[PDB]
Amino acid sequence: FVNQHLCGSHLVEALYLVCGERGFFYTDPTEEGPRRGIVEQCCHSICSLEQLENYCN
């Protein structure tokens, strides 16, 4: 993951990386539109890693 399009769990992964085992908030890829912030921003556009670190716990 390096400031590049990240959708589906390909995004979760990053969060997993930066969040580590501490567990990251993202639920499942389906069910319903996730946070509606990181996804619509990192999937349709690029996003920061510092932005994933606030997702961990």
What's the CATH code of the domain at 17? 1.10.100.10
| 6 touches 27 (CB < 8 A) | no
> Each residue of 17-50: b (16+ CB within 10 Å) or e?
ebbeeeebebeeeeeeebeeebbeebbeeebeee
Domain ranges, residue 23: 1-57
CA distance 42 to 39: 5
Structure tokens, 50: 């510092």
Helix, strand, or coil (residue 24): strand
Q: How many domains does the chain have?
A: 1
Method: NMR
